[PDB]
Structure formats: structure tokens, C-alpha cells
Design a protein around this ligand. Sequence first.
Ligand SMILES: [Zn+2]
Ligand SMILES: [Zn+2]
Ligand SMILES: [Zn+2]
Lengths: 107, 102, 531, 271, 163, 45, 171, 84, 98
Amino acid sequence: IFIYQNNITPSANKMIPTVSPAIIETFQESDLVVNITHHELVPKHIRLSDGEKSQLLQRYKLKESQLPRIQREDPVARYLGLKRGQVVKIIRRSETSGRYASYRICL
Amino acid sequence: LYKEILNVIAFDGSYVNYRHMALLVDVMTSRGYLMAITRHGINRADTALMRCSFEETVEILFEAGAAAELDDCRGVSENVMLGQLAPMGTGAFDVMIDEKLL
Amino acid sequence: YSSAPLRSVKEVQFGLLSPEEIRAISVVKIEYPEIMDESRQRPREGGLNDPKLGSIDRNFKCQTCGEGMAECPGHFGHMELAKPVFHIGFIPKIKKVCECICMNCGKLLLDETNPTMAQAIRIRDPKKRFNAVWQLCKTKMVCEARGGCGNTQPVVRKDGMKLWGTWKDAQPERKLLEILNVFKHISPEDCFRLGFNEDYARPEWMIITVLPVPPPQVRPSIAMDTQGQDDLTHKLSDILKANINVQKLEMDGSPQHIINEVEQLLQFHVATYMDNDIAGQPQALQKSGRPVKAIRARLKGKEGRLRGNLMGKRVFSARTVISGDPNLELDQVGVPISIAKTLSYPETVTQYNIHRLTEYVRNGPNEHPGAKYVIRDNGDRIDLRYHKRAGDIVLQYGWKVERHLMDDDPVLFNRQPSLHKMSMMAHRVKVMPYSTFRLNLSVTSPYNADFDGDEMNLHVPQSEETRAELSQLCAVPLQIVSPQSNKPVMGIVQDTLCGVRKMTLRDTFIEYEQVMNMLFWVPSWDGVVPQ
Amino acid sequence: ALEDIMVHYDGTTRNSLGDIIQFLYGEDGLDGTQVERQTIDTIPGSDKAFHKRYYVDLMDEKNSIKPDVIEYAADILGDVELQKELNSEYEQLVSDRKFLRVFVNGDHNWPLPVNLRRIIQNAQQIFHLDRAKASDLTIPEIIHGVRDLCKKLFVLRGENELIKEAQQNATSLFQCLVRARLATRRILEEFRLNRDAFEWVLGTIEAQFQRSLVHPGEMVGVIAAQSIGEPATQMTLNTFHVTLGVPRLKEILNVAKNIKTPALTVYLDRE
Amino acid sequence: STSTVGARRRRAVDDEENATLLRLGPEFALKQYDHDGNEHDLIALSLSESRLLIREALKARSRARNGSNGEIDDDELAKVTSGANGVVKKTLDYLNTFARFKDEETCTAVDQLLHLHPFEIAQLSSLGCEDVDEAITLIPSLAAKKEVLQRILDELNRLEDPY
Amino acid sequence: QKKAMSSRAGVSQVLNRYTYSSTLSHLRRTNTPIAKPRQLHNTHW
Amino acid sequence: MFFLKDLSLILTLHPSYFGPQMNQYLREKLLTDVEGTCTGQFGYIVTVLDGMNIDVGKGRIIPGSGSAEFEVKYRAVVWKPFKGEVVDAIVSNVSPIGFFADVGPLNVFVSTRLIPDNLVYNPSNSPPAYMSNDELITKGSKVRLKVVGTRTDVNEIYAIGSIKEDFLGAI
Amino acid sequence: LAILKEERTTTPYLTKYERARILGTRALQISMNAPVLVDIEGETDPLQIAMKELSQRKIPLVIRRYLPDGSYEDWGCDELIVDN
Amino acid sequence: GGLRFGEMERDCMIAHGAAGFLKELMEASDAFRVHVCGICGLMSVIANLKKNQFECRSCKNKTNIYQLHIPYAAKLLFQELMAMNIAPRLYTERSGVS
Ligand SMILES: [Zn+2]
Ligand SMILES: [Zn+2]
Ligand SMILES: [Zn+2]
């Protein structure tokens, strides 16, 4: 997790996915001054073991694609450091039931 | 997105129930980002006969016979176009005579 | 009745006609460009329309597959073009394909070898694959030698109905004729690499060799008792003629560079026929200025087949002028006798209603509580107003009778613009006099009508369930509480409202004489005058 | 854009692809028709006036149910085991009060299935209750009884947990409204319900609710689609009297990259 | 109509010739599919063995339906439990004037033995045979699937129920 | 006429005859080939 | 050659027959539509095994009218000749162009051109026969033939064949 | 496919659409000279006859409810509680 | 003529979940019996409705044939698409599953 101040070189970062299994992320400084999750509109998200996931799917009879998605370059997706294939349970307040439980897989 | 749409209905005195706006809001949102309710949106998802019944009608078919698309016929539209009962409430199931109980 | 098993479409497969198939299917060699006249004699020359295709004039004739006009869907014929042509709407892809494949050879321009290509090659999406691919191969123009012959690939551009490119000091311009051949060679795993399908639609078929000629029901003729021929039944002939001359220049003193000048014409008329609304203007008007509807014009949304004839069609229906009636239960709808005596309802004969039906039938189509058609098991119909056995007929359980709509028949009443679940509601029928649909006031705002001339459409259910479905979910009473704003959507309007106010004030008093005639008007009245 | 959206036999709102658009229609699985503007008591008012309403203290001369309300008012004063079920309860209501302040506005009026205000008013005269002679409910009768109710207000039905969770989830809000009107204090001091009445109100809340649930089949999309566009045909193209109304909705549905009025509201920091 | 338990999706011309090259229709592959959704070996039915399956069903049939010497004792069980279906009479006479056995055991035996790809195990049973040169000829699919089979061929005429 | 429909239809119509004030009106009519033009300008006084 | 294939059939049923013993009527109608049919696809449907436990499954009610649709899943005994297949039946008829034989529910015909030359068609003989240097064939006589080709027809599958090879002919 | 009479999850109540259509079907069924399982206590209009056939839960019919994935749940008209 | 049941009228019925009635686009308008091919899902079939003869040479069939009920406007939609060279195959059984 490198925290580049103004910007990294195009020659540089072109060396990230070059050391698997391990994985690396890049975060600009001026973009972490305020924790975005902290926002009013931002509801709480949550990761899911390939167990809690392989469950949601059986429990709802879903074909993975039929599940609401979330972007890899999504502000929150990055924050919790998701990956293509991981699921996320969102839990927010609802003026209809009190709390609703939605899920987004990360494409 | 919701808040903004709501404030557009509500700025007119008219009242609509959450569930409605929400559903719309949700449909635009779910595929990952902000899919617009336009020829360049929903009418561009993995939904051929269907999307063909709105805006790009013909080319939508052309590049459909081109890549040889297969249509479920799971869309309300397909069935209307076919003249079959569509999987809509009343048709979202089957009705069979139980000989045993008969 | 058709012995063949009855089924419903559970899947639709799209693709492009392989020339060999069109040939297969065709029942007409279609060589001549005229219609019929065996030298003025009316018939149908073995040349154009019906050289075995469908038919006109109420003549079973149609390759003995009889059926005459109604029952006989059309029958396709074909036409061997003199030289390969571009399918007007695919000209875009046909071009983007070449931009991605090499000529003189015919294979991809980026193999698993190129990394950025692997990726594109893994993108599972018949469309975004062929998308990402082209975004790559449109740059490299050297058939690098794996496969061989690095002949430089030209940069292609669109000029009207022809694809041309330059090979490079200073270029060298040539007009790509040739293409089809290259495509045919394109590898099978390659069709698939691009957005294709080896079975249903191979890249090559985007170019037409043998043209599929659609039959009469498609381009019907309209005689004036005198000629009368459809629009398409012309640009078929315009094409046919542009084909004839071509060939008769390739088997005679063929001035090889004065033929192409005549090939471009056929390419055009065939562009026309299917599409006649393009970039390179030349509207291609029919003698008179008339634009000439291209097949694709018949489809363009709204008015055009898809949105005009399928997502909505004219349909046992009636419409006239509304005026409200303050003495009709909320859910009723007064229908002018005239109309009830016109709209019928197929009620099968049953030992519960035989007695009443045999009466309604004798009554004839001109007495109101009557009927107008009796249909025996033998799929045939008796017209209750002519048949010499009009008043005769004694029914048979199982026969169906078409009776006049009667009081308490559920029917769909509506007023468009139909933007509500409530713009259409099922009402109890009440046959009444005078030429107008008489609806209740409180059921006014749902349709949003007034009586300054406003008209209303009425539809009549036809099955025993159709009706039920209309009364169990669309009945006006079920509609009183609107889901859109979780509150009712019909209240007390005008007079009734205005007055209900007055009548309420402490100052409003009524004496016995009237307090009685008032209690009488309440139908449910317990029959007890309150202290 | 919503044609093919319809509640499914499992209570999922999906389309012609099975793609789940909503796991429980409206985030509760309720049919708008059966819903009315109720007022969640708990939320509004002072901490002082709150307590004086739902608080019951059997271990106290001044904060106990006077034996003129209950039929065991004196034989109940001081019971430690009862004052505990009475805590579970009062401790709950407080969890609510703080959980509802979901609505940072404080506005306690919201659309909620099963109209409890009336449902009780029906008991009111069905058994003719006097604002004088005492009820006949064990404190367990009331408290325990409202818990057994919550158990039958089923929306989703699944056997497993993820489902059973959704159950509790998409319900909650209701339950709070439920407790709010079925706190021992109110149920006895406000609407003197007999033992009989209570068993009726309860039974009805339950029944009513079950009817108020959405029906799988409900062609939901076309519904909300219109429900939204309809109250739009009734607006003016004008943006007079920030870009709003007709053109705005337009602006939005288009997911415009350059709205006429962009503007942006920022609030100071806490202090 | 009446379709089998092999529902393939014929998506938009590949049915080679039928020969004793053991290339039976696609509807009779060595691997057909059971009604319960299981995999099951084809069902070879040499004559006589066929004559039994038939006689047995026509019987437990004329049972719940009431809930040259055999040429007759079979013509009767017919005009009662049969559509009343000439094809069967023929398939029964023929299957009874050529059946090579009589006892459900003598038939069990042949099978407990012979059991090659189903068609063979049957042809060998319903067709008289002496030499291998002969069997390998009237059953041209064998040839290299069993050295000159001769033993077995004998063991048949040895259990070849008398007539 | 010809392959020139690229003209304007409207010029010359079928004179009204429902009422007298109908006919007068019809003759004193103006057209304008196609939110601001439709307005009643001042100059219109 | 005889097989036991696991088929199924669909029958629509008018509401009239919605009595207490319905299972019964479907079953008996099943038989009227299967036992005796013939498709080149499935061959000769001749007999339905294990009647008693026939499978009906619940049937669905067609929307327009009232009938119920049942997918009856059974199992039966069938027989469909293959090319190159070898069997033997009783000679049925016999002309100048050859003779027809009957193997079960079938009739395979042998051409005077698909026999051994030294066997000529007999002129005035009763019943008309064929003479060999030693053999004599007529109606009655049993023949073992080889099915060269097969033609699928109406509700009957006929074929052709020869006895020009070895080990074929009378027995 | 399938789904035991057990582990059945859908509503034990009858959707307005189910009832509407059941009565629908059974109604025309009767008008098709079908056989009735009640006492036409003088009734003659099929939908009425069927409405009765409902209140006495003697309408031999089964609703095969489909799930988005493709599986189903069978329920008899007798079972299905008919609140509405 | 007859009053049109245009799109908007469609919509509503669909909102009502009035499945059958809406299906009844068919009974009150188009409807039509076309004969498809079990193989090349087309409206080719030469159905001489009497002597039963069905066929569809080119695909040379006389055995696997189906009859269907669709709105003639639609039958036309297809004939049209074909003459534009696109092939709307009509299949009576799902093979792709899901
Ligand atoms: Zn024809
Ligand atoms: Zn090359
Ligand atoms: Zn075909």
C-alpha cells in the first residue's frame, strides 16, 4: 500500500501485478484526507468469505451474474480492497423496514 | 439519485410511495454504475426482440442475426410479440390436474 | 384442423441466410421482371410473383398446397444476382472485419502471441470481444509472419456503397471489389474470435449472392376492380432489371471497365430495397418523387410493425361519447342498446343455460335481449339473420352461441392517454337507450374524463376466464385504493360534494315528508326511521 | 425500462434475467395499497414525557400500575421476577427510540402496513370497555403476548438463516410501531383492554399484516414506472415560480454530464 | 409423437449411415439414459428372450385388467389385452416360431453366459450358429473381438431347448 | 411535381364552409414553417 | 435387434374424463396411440412393459380451454431393422422379381438380382417358387436374409436385402 | 427437477392472480360441459359454480409455482389458504 | 374498422397482471396458424392440409413439424426479416437451459 503524494510514474506502477500471489494497491494522498466511508450517504459494506458467498448463492438460487455488482475502481471497493469475484453485503437504514440487506459482487 | 428524483416530484405537491422511485433508482444503479434510462442504457443490457421494441428497432435485429443471438423469450415483450401468455403474475406458473385427487 | 402437433415458441435463433439455403427453399426461379399478362392475358407469368409463390384472385392455386389466400402463409422465391453485393446494413461490419483481417491470405492480425490480444480473446461477450479486438487490429497493417505473407494491409474508408483503401512515397489507391473470397478463407476459430457463429451466421454471408424474394402477403397488390402494385414489388423489379443487363454485358462485348459502372447500380438497388434512408443522399425516389419505402422503413419504431402492429394493435370493441349518470352504481357503465346489439359473447351451450339461449337465439339479432350467431361442433357458422332455419334451430350441448352483451357482463372500459393502472377498469354492463356510454361521476378522475365531448373505448372479454380475470383484478371496486400514492383515487366530485357540505351545517334541517323520501333513496335502508 | 420487473415467488424483485433488482420489494415486501400514515410514538417528545408513558416500576410506590388498572395491582407490587420482564421491555423501547433517530429529521409520520390506531378502536366498542373497572392480564399476559405476535408477522419464509435474517431485517420498523402501542402502560392505562380484547387485537394485527404483504406475480416495474411518470404529466415544462420539475426529471433520467444548475451544499463542521 | 430420454438441442445434417458396424441410430447408443435420470446400458433383446418379456407383460396386464400349442395359448391372451394391433400377433407368431428356447431359466442361462456390445450378445443368441467363420460372418462386428467364440457357440446348441 | 416532393404542403387548402365567420377567418390566415416564435410578441399589436 | 427403449408421450385430455378412475383412461388411451405405431426414429412400437406402475406425473391445465396436459413416461419393446443386420423370417409372397420375407412385424424383399444366379424363378408352379441345383423356395419355406437397405414409411418400415453372401438362404 | 412437499417455502396463501385464474379456468372448464363437484344449488353461470367449488375447496387443481432459477413448488387449491 | 389496443393499453393490462385477457393481441385481432420446421426454425413448410403431406424440401423433412399460433403481424415481421436476409428461427423447445 504505497501512498503517492502527487503522482507515480507510468514507468513505475507498470510493475504492480508482477509479484503474485501477493497484490499491491496505490492511493493518492489528496484522496485519503477524509475517510469516505464516514459520509452520511455511505452505508456500511462488508466482505464475505468464499463460504459466506457460496452460501448467499445457494440461499437465493443465484447465478453470480444475477447479483447486483460494484465497480473495482469504486471508492468503497478500493477502501476495503476488493477483488474481481468477491461479494459485499451492504446494510443501510430504510424508511420502510428500518434496515435492508443488499449485496454487490465486484466485477 | 433517489433524493434528487424524490425532490422533483415533491417540489410539485404530489406524493409517491418510496418503493416506486426506489425501484427505478435501483434499476439504474445495480449493473455497477449509472445506467441511463435511454437508448444508451437499459436498452443496451443483456436483455433481442425486446430491446428491438424501442428506438434502434432494425439495426438491433441486424446485429442480432449477425452474431446469431438466442432469445430466451423470458421477456414480457417477446411473448406479446409472439402471442403467447407472458410469465406475468397470472402466467408466472402452471396449472395441472391432479388425477390422484380427481 | 391441422394434424401437426401444436407448440409455443420457447426460443428464437437469429442468423443470416447462407446463399445455398435461400436457393434450397425457393420455389421460384424468378427470371422475368414483369408480373403476369401472358401478353395482356391475365394470369401470372412463370417469371415474377407466383412462378409458384403465393397467389391472388381467390384461387386455391398455389402449388396445389391450395388453401387459397387465407391459410397459405407466403412462399419464398429467389434470384441469382450476377455479382456479389453488400448487405446495406452490414456494410459497417463488413468493413470493420477487413480492418481486422489480412487479405490475399485471410487470417487474424493478432495471435495469442500478442499479449493485449490474449485478454481481448478471453473477453466472453460475443459483442465486446469483437469490440476490443477491432480496437487493436485496426492499427497494425503488416501481416507479420506463424501464418505468412506480410503483404501490407490497406487502410479502408467508406465512400457511398464502396470500400476503398490505400497501400503505402505517396499511397496507391484501389477500390476493393475480392472481399467475399477473403472472408470465406477466414478461419473457423477466427469467425468465432470475432462476433460470429459458424452454424447460424458466418462472416461471409454478410454479402449476398442469391437474393431471397419475399411473396405476395408481404408485398400485396391492390387492383382497382387496372394495375396496382406494391412498392417492394418494384425495387425487386428494379433490381431484377439491373441484374439482367449486367449479365448481358458479361457474355457479349464486355467493355471490362464499363461494366463496373453498371455493377454499382445493382449494389444500389439492393441497398435501396432493404434500406432507403442513408448517408450518401441519393434518396432514390420512385417516378413521381415518392421516396419508396425500404423494408427497414416498415419496421422503424412507432407505426412500424414492431411498435406499431405488435406492441399494440387495433382490437369486440366500441367507442362513443361519455356523459356521467348520477343513478349508476359506481362500477356500472351504461351501454347504448345499439352497441350491445352489435358486440357478442361466445357462450357454450350448457344444460344450465340451454333454455335461456334457445330463447335468446329465437329472439334474433334485432331484439335486444337476443343473439346473432350459432356455431355447431362442425367448425362452421350459422348467421342468425339470414339462414333459412333462423327461428328453427334447436341447440346441442357443446355448440357455442354468440349472444348480445347483457346487463352485468364484465367489460374493459378505458380512456386514453392510458397512463394508469386505472386508465382501464372492468365495469358491470347496463344496456341503456341513447347513443352514449354512461359512467358514474366518482369514477371520473381515474380516467380523467369530462363530458365536453370526450370519448371512451370499450373492450369485451371473450373466454370464461378472460371475464373472471377482468372482474377479480380490474373491477372498479378493487381499484379504489391507488398503490401509487397509497391513498384512494376516487372521491365525491362537484354537485354531490358541494351539496354534501350544505346538508351538513347545523343550520340544515329537514322535515318528515322529506326525511322519508330521503331514507327511501338509500337502497340498503333498514326500513327504520331514526328518532 | 421496467416492463419485465415482477415480484417472484421467493419475494425477490427481478427481471427477464433473474438479475435481482431488489431482494424484498420495497425493502419490506409490502403492497402499497395496504399501507397508511402512522406515527411512531417513541421517536418524538422529551425523555421526561417518554418515561412517564411506557415506564412501569413494580418496585416503586409512585411508578407502579395502580391496582385500579390491573386486577392484580396490589398482589403484583414488588415482584422481582416480573419487574425483570418489565425491564426487558422498557430496555427495548429505549433501543428503539435511539434506533429511530434512521429518521434524523425526527418526523415520526410514516407509511406502515396494518393500521393499529383503528384496529384497537374496533376492540374499543366491540366489547364495550369502561374507563373505570380494571383489566385482567398478567404482566406476562401483555409483554409475553406481544413477543409471540412478532413471531407470526412473517414476510419471507425460508428454512435457513440468511433468509431468517432477512425476516427480522425487513420487518423491524413495524415491530417498533407494534411495541409503541402495546407497551404494558398504554395497553392498560390508556386503552383499558380486557384479556379478551388483547387476544383479539393481537390476532388481527397478525391477520391484517399477512394480507398486507405483496403478491408474487405483481407486475411491479410497469407499476412503479407509471406511478412515477403519471405525477409528471401533471407538471409544467417551466422551471420558474434551481433547474427543477419536468426538465429536471429529464435531465436526470438522461444521467446528464452537465446539468444547467450544478450547485452544491456544504454544512459547517460539528461545532 | 413420443420422444425418448435423449433431449439434445438441434440448433439449426449429421446422421451417418446405419450399419452392422455397430453404428446404430443416435437413439440406440451403447449409452442411453434411464427414466429416473441414470445411465444405463442399451437393451439387447434376442428373439425368444423377447417372446418372454412380451408374454409376461401381456399377462400381468390381463391380471390387473381383472382387478403350435402356444400358437393358441397366445392368440387368446391377445384378443383381450391387445388393441385388437395386428403387428403384435405377427411379432408373436414369428417370435414364437423362431424363438430358440422355452424356460425363463434356459433363457436366463444364455444371458448369464454370453454377457460384447448389446446387439451382438443378442444376435448370437437369436441366430443359429456353428462355425466362428459363420458367426463372425453373420455378425461382422465381431471378427477381432474374440478368438475363433466357438466354445460358446456350442454351449448354446447344448442348451438349445428341444421343440 | 416530379421527383421533387422537396416542397411545402399547406399552401392552398380547402376553403371552410361550416359557418360564415369560419370562411372569413380561413382567408385571413397565416402560416410559418418551423419555444420563442409561438409567443405573442409586442410587434404583434 | 429387439430393444427396450424408455420413451414418453403427451396426451391432452378433455375435462369430461375428469372422473375418479382417470389414471385408467389415460393409460388405455396411451396404448391406443403407442402399441402399434412406427417411426423410423424409434422403430416399431409393439408392446408396453410393466403396465401397472405406468407413470403419469401431475398434468397441467391448458389455459384457453380446460384440458390437462400429461407427460406419460413409460418403457416398451420395439424393433427397427438396421442395414447389414442379419435375420430370418417366413417367406410371405413371391414373384418374378423376387420374394418377400417376414421377420416379425416386418417385410424385407429379395431381388432376383440379389440371389445366387443358379436359382431361377419358377414359371407355372403352385404355389409359385424358385429352383436351385438342389434348393426350392416357396411361401412356407424359412429363409435367413441380410438387410442391405432400409426405407422408412407411413406406419411401416420395409427394407431390402440379399442371400448372395454365404450362410444365407434356406435352413 | 422437483422440490419435496417438504421444505416448501412460498406463501401458504393464494395470490390474487392464482385465485383469479383458478376461478377463471375452472369456470370455462365447467362451461365446456365439464363435470362439477358440488351442488349446483340452482346455480347456472359457471363462474358462480366455480366460486362455490372454491368455498368448499373441491376444485381438483394444482398450482406449480416457478422460481426464477427454474424449479417449482406444487400446491393444491385445497391446501392454499384462501384469505383475500 | 376496429379500435386499436396500442402500447399504452398493453402496459396497463400488464400492470394488472391480466395475463390471459391481454393474450386474448391474439383472439381479438391477428392470430394465425403458421407451420414451422423442427429443424430450420422457419415458416417454410409446404403444408397441404388434407393429404397431410407436410414437407419442407431444402431441409427435406415430412416427419418433424410443428404448428404454432402467432399474430400474423408477427408472421409478417419474420417473412420481412428473411427477405432482408436475417433468419428468425422459431424453436419449440429450449436447449440453452437456465
Ligand atoms: Zn402454399
Ligand atoms: Zn496474410
Ligand atoms: Zn427445415
